[PDB]
Amino acid sequence: DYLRELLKGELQGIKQYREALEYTHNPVLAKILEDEEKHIEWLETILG
Amino acid sequence: DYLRELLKGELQGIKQYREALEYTHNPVLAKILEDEEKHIEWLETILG
Ligand SMILES: [Zn+2]
Ligand SMILES: [Zn+2]
Structure with missing residues (x-):
């Protein structure tokens, strides 16, 4: 769940x-x- | 007050x-x- 908690805040x-x-x-x-x-897309691009 | 809100949570x-x-x-x-x-020290440096 931590990734969504990260992404929501930036x-x-x-x-x-x-x-x-x-x-x-x-x-x-x-x-x-x-x-x-x-940064938001930089965290997300990693997930798949 | 916006500066305090910016700084605190990075x-x-x-x-x-x-x-x-x-x-x-x-x-x-x-x-x-x-x-x-x-980012924090970046926006904090400007007020000097
Ligand atoms: Zn960021
Ligand atoms: Zn930041």
């Missing part, structure tokens, strides 16, 4: 990071959420 | 990923958890 971060560039205007979010966008 | 992934490789045995967690280890 999705909770992708949508919040896309808001934060309005207040930070930084290139850091163009690395952080750029990784979180791949 | 470690609710980092420690979980470190255990999950004992079941998965895959190099992808050495890209997922490799990046979550940066």
Whole structure:
């Protein structure tokens, strides 16, 4: 069950990071959420 | 307050990923958890 508990939680971060560039205007979010966008599918691609 | 909400729970992934490789045995967690280890200090560094 742990994989689904993992996968549900990274999705909770992708949508919040896309808001934060309005207040930070930084290139850091163009690395952080750029990784979180791949990460969910990166865990999943392994399963089969 | 959004920054506190962003920061606190990336470690609710980092420690979980470190255990999950004992079941998965895959190099992808050495890209997922490799990046979550940066992600917290990445968004924390900007406020200085
Ligand atoms: Zn991630
Ligand atoms: Zn993260």
